[PDB]
Every structure is written in C-alpha cells, then in structure tokens.
Design an enzyme around this catalytic site. Structure first.
Site, PDB file in Angstrom:
ATOM      1  N   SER A   9       0.779  -1.244   0.000  1.00 19.57           N
ATOM      2  CA  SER A   9       0.000   0.000   0.000  1.00 19.57           C
ATOM      3  C   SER A   9       0.803   1.281   0.000  1.00 19.57           C
ATOM      4  CB  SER A   9      -0.966   0.037   1.179  1.00 19.57           C
ATOM      5  OG  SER A   9      -0.276   0.154   2.408  1.00 19.57           O
ATOM      6  N   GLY A  42      -1.896  -4.109   1.383  1.00 22.63           N
ATOM      7  CA  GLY A  42      -1.988  -5.189   2.347  1.00 22.63           C
ATOM      8  C   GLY A  42      -1.185  -6.442   2.089  1.00 22.63           C
ATOM      9  N   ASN A  74       3.988  -5.214   5.844  1.00 18.40           N
ATOM     10  CA  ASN A  74       2.994  -6.217   6.233  1.00 18.40           C
ATOM     11  C   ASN A  74       3.557  -7.595   6.530  1.00 18.40           C
ATOM     12  OD1 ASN A  74       0.243  -4.761   5.544  1.00 18.40           O
ATOM     13  ND2 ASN A  74       1.682  -4.301   3.900  1.00 18.40           N
ATOM     14  N   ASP A 192      -2.916   7.768   9.224  1.00 20.42           N
ATOM     15  CA  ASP A 192      -2.038   6.970  10.072  1.00 20.42           C
ATOM     16  C   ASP A 192      -0.571   7.251   9.753  1.00 20.42           C
ATOM     17  OD1 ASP A 192      -1.206   5.337   7.808  1.00 20.42           O
ATOM     18  OD2 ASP A 192      -3.125   4.303   8.013  1.00 20.42           O
ATOM     19  N   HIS A 195       0.549   5.233   5.611  1.00 16.04           N
ATOM     20  CA  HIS A 195       0.003   5.691   4.345  1.00 16.04           C
ATOM     21  C   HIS A 195       0.179   7.184   4.093  1.00 16.04           C
ATOM     22  CE1 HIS A 195      -2.317   1.978   5.556  1.00 16.04           C
ATOM     23  NE2 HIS A 195      -1.829   1.616   4.384  1.00 16.04           N
TER      24      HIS A 195
END
Ligand SMILES: *[C@@H]1O[C@H](CO)[C@@H](O)[C@H](O)[C@H]1NC(C)=O
Ligand SMILES: *[C@@H]1O[C@H](CO)[C@@H](O)[C@H](O)[C@H]1NC(C)=O
EC number: 3.1.1.86
Length: 233
Positions: A9, A42, A74, A192, A195
C-alpha cells in the site's frame, strides 16, 4: 522497455485508500520506459507470493525489462493468529507451518521469498532490483527517530544471496524526512503513520530515484533527468 513494480500500500495506486497514494505512481514522468504498478495494498512477501502475483509478472516480463520489489510493512505479526501475511522468522532456509484459510501452508522466511522471486525474474532475462521498505512517520513523536525494521537489512541480505541489485530506499527517505522537519513531514501522514498523502508519495518516489542515481543502479540508464533533492548516502 517495461518497469514492473511489486509492493504494498505504500507503493500501490490509491495507496491505502481515503485519499492517500503509493510512491509507484510518481515514477512515469522521470523514466523513458513504461511503468506498470502491480503493488497491492496489504500484501507481504508471503501473501504476494501465494496469491500468484509474482507469477503474473514473470509471465509477461520480457528480456531487458526491470522489476522492483519492495515489501516489509505487512511482513510482521504472529502466526498464532495467522493473518495470512506474516512470514516465518529468520533469514534463511527456515520453514514454518500454519493452517491459513483451511490449508496447511508452508511458510518461508522474508529473504527466501524475495530470493525465489528474484531468481524467477532473472531466469526470464529481466533486471531485478530489491528495495528496502519505506519508513513510517519518523516525526510522529514530535522528534525525529531513526529506527529501521528488520526487513530493511533482510532486503539487502536477500539481494546479495540472489546476486541482484539493492537500493536502500529506507535510508534515502528518512534522510530527506529529517531535512524537511516536524511540521512538513507530519502533513504527509493524514490518517495513520504508514500511508502517505499524494504530496508525500511524490517525495518518497524522488527519494528512490535519488538512491538509484547515487548508488549507480542499472535503472539509471532509463532516467530522463538526474536533478533530484537531497545528497548521496
Ligand atoms: C503441516 O505439515 C507439517 C509437515 O508436513 C506437519 O508437521 C504439521 O503438523 C502440519 N500442520 C498441521 C496443523 O497439521
Ligand atoms: C509537530 O507538528 C504537529 C502537526 O503539525 C503539531 O501538532 C505538533 O505540535 C508539532 N510538535 C512539535 C514538538 O513541534
């Protein structure tokens, strides 16, 4: 020539959604080659491998093409409650077992996943570039903190073993993040600490190209300019 991007992402189109974006979306304009952004939100080295996403790239890659792989965000977590992305701990031939989605899965280590992918692309005549993950907001606590994850080193280690090129994307991003300061960098992370906003995604992209130029990565051959921010190392 074609440049394929494999990542999560932080690289993918639309980033993590909600108005954020990935850094892969800001390369096209500085390259004289077609850029295909196959990053998906993800995904971990494991998740991406199991979903057959590395294969999709291998099927279409032609000799002389470029493949940039960058994962890490991730790849952590715990296998007790397998989320489907967590890799097996270690840096070598370690192998973990876990039932995910009703299948007893054979889970490898982070470097192993990257090494296998690298070999697969090299076999097709493509030029592979493994890149260290981008950093989470270092100015999150109001003070600049440089604390790389284990996946930064694991990416460098994977490159050596596979005999491909490595670009320390982490260090080059943190470097300018430090220069830009608290106020500026924090605006790159609306929602967040992972991102990036479109504005931030661009800077992260520029950081990558600065690394390419500074380290002398083969991809420099298709660069339309070498005037990027920051200094080498
Ligand atoms: C998955 O396979 C491994 C080796 O084949 C085995 O040792 C392990 O018990 C299996 N996991 C489960 C939950 O059956
Ligand atoms: C850093 O910037 C944030 C957001 O712009 C602000 O709320 C915070 O007070 C600043 N912290 C310091 C230590 O300057």
């Amino acid at each position: 020539t074609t440049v394929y991007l494999a990542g999560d992402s932080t690289m993918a189109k639309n980033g993590g959604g909600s108005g954020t974006n990935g850094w892969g979306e800001y390369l096209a304009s500085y390259l004289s080659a077609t850029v295909v952004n196959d990053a998906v939100a993800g995904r971990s080295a494991r998740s991406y491998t199991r979903e057959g996403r590395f294969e999709n790239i291998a099927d279409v890659v032609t000799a002389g093409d470029y493949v940039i792989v960058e994962f890490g965000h991730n790849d952590g977590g715990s296998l007790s409650t397998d989320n489907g992305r967590t890799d097996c701990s270690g840096t070598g031939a370690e192998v973990c077992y876990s039932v995910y989605d009703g299948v007893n899965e054979t889970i490898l280590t982070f470097p192993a996943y990257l090494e296998n992918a690298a070999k697969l692309f090299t076999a097709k005549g493509a030029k592979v570039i493994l890149s260290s993950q981008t950093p989470n907001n270092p100015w999150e606590t109001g003070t600049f903190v440089n604390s790389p994850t284990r996946f930064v080193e694991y990416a460098e280690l994977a490159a050596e073993v596979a005999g491909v090129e490595y670009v320390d994307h982490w260090s080059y991003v943190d470097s300018i993040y430090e220069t830009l300061g608290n106020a500026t960098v924090n605006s790159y992370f609306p929602i967040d600490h992972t991102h990036t906003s479109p504005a931030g995604a661009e800077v992260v992209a520029e950081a990558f190209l600065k690394a390419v130029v500074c380290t002398g990565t083969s991809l420099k051959s298709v660069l339309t300019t070498t005037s990027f921010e920051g200094t080498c190392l």
